[PDB]
């Protein structure tokens, strides 16, 4: 979107997920990420002890023929005040068929549970439409990941969905 | 069906359409609902701007002599987190001859376009076989509709088909 179309009160802008991690975009696809009995909605708190295992993830889709990639990052590493490891890639699942979820995709970076030690961390899930199956691949390491660059490299365009939770040391 | 015959990975169970709205059932009849150039398949996203007009609806059938009823509900009203208006009846078409579609039936509750304002809403189409033509009639209001009770009142048994899309505010 153009900056003339941005809603500056959107929770992704207030939280600076759009800004620090993502360019402005219009949500268009369902992304349902569940830990326990809570679906991630922007700004919900989940403690480290609640996110030790991968969440359930269900997605929508625009066309049955589509495949989606799910990115999970913590931008606030090692801390939000000095985030020199931004972004830390916690999980990467490609080739998710439209309308299914991560158990139907290819987990190309395994789920590492977030365990913040300093400050309140945003933990962000981002969904992208792929140009086709078997077109998106993993970085060589988890730290200093750049979702914007990743999307550029893999022709992913703007995200179709994103949502985040907050987490801090217990 | 018995709970010993349920496929717990069925998309209608994962999405809780079976659970929140419907009892478990085996699909037996074709239900093709089209908005624009997309047929509704479970979990597809359609934005409010894409569903302003009634969809095209074509049905199958078990016997030419049969008549079917189409129910369209949003269970996630006013929001999925606090769905105290569940279900909102968006459309009701009775007396659809087997193998035809809604233009051949009796629209007894007019199509109200879904326009969610909070959360992601499931918008569900449910098809039932009638005991006969001219046996199924409309409620007095749209809110707090109960498809299970409706089916009991009108001898509709279990659904023969159901499908849903996801929609959220634009």
What's the CA gap between B25 and B158, in Å, rounded?
Answer: 6
What's the CA gap between A91 and A108, in Å, rounded?
Answer: 8
Q: What are phi and psi of A164, to 5 degrees?
A: -140, 155
- The CA distances from residue A73 to A41, A86, A91, A164, B95, in Å, are 16, 9, 7, 9, 52
Q: Which two tokens stand for residue B132?
A: 């006969």
DSSP states of A106-155 as a string? EEEE--------SS-EEEEEEEEE-SSTT-----S-STT--HHHHHHHTT
Cross-chain residue pair A62–B45, CB shorter than 8 Å: yes
B170 in contact with chain A, both atoms CB, cutoff 8 A: yes
What's the CA gap between A49 and B169, in Å, rounded?
Answer: 33
SS3 of residue B41 by DSSP: coil
- The CA distances from residue A85 to A88, A93, B105, in Å, are 7, 21, 62
Residue among A30, A63, A98 minimizing CB distance to B120? A30
What contacts 24+ positions apart, CB below 8 Å, involve B46-51? B46/B123, B46/B165, B46/B166, B46/B167, B47/A28, B47/B167, B47/B168, B47/B170, B48/B113, B48/B114, B48/B115, B48/B116, B48/B167, B48/B169, B48/B170, B49/B170, B51/B113, B51/B114, B51/B123, B51/B165, B51/B167
Sign of the torsion formed by the C-alpha atoms of A155, A159, A160 and A165: positive
Q: Which residue of A has its CA nearest to B9?
A: A100
How many whole angstroms from its chain centre is CA A58?
13
Task: Please confirm whether the linkage preceding B155 is cis (ω < 30° from 0).
Answer: no
DSSP annotation of B42 reads T
Instruction: For residue A122, give the CATH number of its domain.
Output: 3.90.280.10
What's the CA gap between A88 and A109, in Å, rounded?
Answer: 12
Residue among B15, B38, B42 minimizing CB distance to A63? B38
Cross-chain residue pair A62–B44, CB shorter than 8 Å: yes
> Comparing C-alpha atoms, which of A44, A53, A128, A57 is closest to residue B14?
A57
B38-39 β-sheet, strand order:
B38-39, B31-35, B56-59
Radius of gyration of chain B (CA): 15
Q: What are phi and psi of B166, to 5 degrees?
A: -100, 145
SS3 of residue B128 by DSSP: strand
> Comparing C-alpha atoms, which of B150, B160, B52, B42 is closest to residue B92?
B150
Among B39, B166, B170, most A C-beta atoms within 10 A, so best to mutate, is B166
Cross-chain residue pair A58–B170, CB shorter than 8 Å: no
Domain that holds residue A105: 1-170
Q: Residue holding tokens 């979990």?
A: B43
- The experimental technique behind this entry is X-ray
Task: Please confirm whether the linkage preceding B132 is cis (ω < 30° from 0).
Answer: no
DSSP annotation of B93 reads E
Q: Residue holding tokens 């048994």?
A: B157
Q: Which two tokens stand for residue A156?
A: 């992913």
Non-local CB neighbours of B56 within 8 Å, separated by 6+ positions: B32, B33, B34, B35, B101
Domain count, chain A: 1
Q: Residue holding tokens 């069906």?
A: B1
Beta carbons of B93 and B110 less than 8 angstroms apart: no
User: Looking at B18-136, which runs of residues are DSSP E strands?
Assistant: 31-35, 38-39, 44-45, 56-59, 67-74, 88-97, 106-109, 121-129
- The CA distances from residue A22 to A113, A149, B35, B138, in Å, are 22, 10, 31, 48
How many whole angstroms from its chain centre is CA A140?
18
Size of interface A-B (CB pairs under 8 A): 37
- The CA distances from residue B2 to B5, B23, B25, B108, B160, in Å, are 5, 10, 9, 33, 16
Q: Per 3-state DSSP, what percentage of chain A is helix, strand, and coil (rounded to 5)?
A: 15, 30, 55
Beta carbons of A19 and A140 less than 8 angstroms apart: no
Per DSSP, chain A holds a count of helices (H) and strands (E) of: 3, 9
How many whole angstroms from its chain centre is CA A152?
16
Q: Per 3-state DSSP, what percentage of chain B is helix, strand, and coil (rounded to 5)?
A: 15, 30, 55
Non-local CB neighbours of A30 within 8 Å, separated by 6+ positions: A58, A59, A60, A161, B43, B45, B120, B166, B168
* Contacts with A, B 63-122, CB within 8 Å: 119-120
How many whole angstroms from its chain centre is CA A113?
14
What's the CA gap between B153 and B144, in Å, rounded?
Answer: 16
Among A11, A31, A32, most B C-beta atoms within 10 A, so best to mutate, is A32
């Amino acid at each position: 979107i153009s900056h003339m179309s941005i809603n500056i009160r959107d929770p992704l802008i207030v939280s600076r997920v759009v800004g620090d991690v993502l360019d402005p975009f219009n949500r268009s696809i369902t992304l349902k990420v569940t830990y326990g009995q809570r679906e991630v909605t922007n700004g919900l708190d989940l403690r480290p002890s609640q996110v030790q295992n991968k969440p359930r993830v269900e997605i929508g889709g625009e066309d049955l023929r589509n495949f989606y990639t799910l990115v999970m990052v913590d931008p606030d590493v090692p801390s939000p005040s000095n985030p020199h490891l931004r972004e830390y890639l916690h999980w990467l699942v490609t080739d998710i068929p439209a309308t299914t979820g991560t158990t139907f995709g290819n987990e190309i970076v395994s789920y590492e549970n977030p365990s913040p030690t300093a400050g309140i961390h945003r933990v962000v899930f981002i969904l992208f439409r792929q140009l086709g199956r078997q077109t998106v691949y993993a970085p060589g390491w988890r730290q200093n990941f750049n979702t914007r660059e990743f999307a550029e490299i893999y022709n992913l365009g703007l995200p179709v969905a994103a949502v985040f939770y907050n987490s801090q040391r217990e």
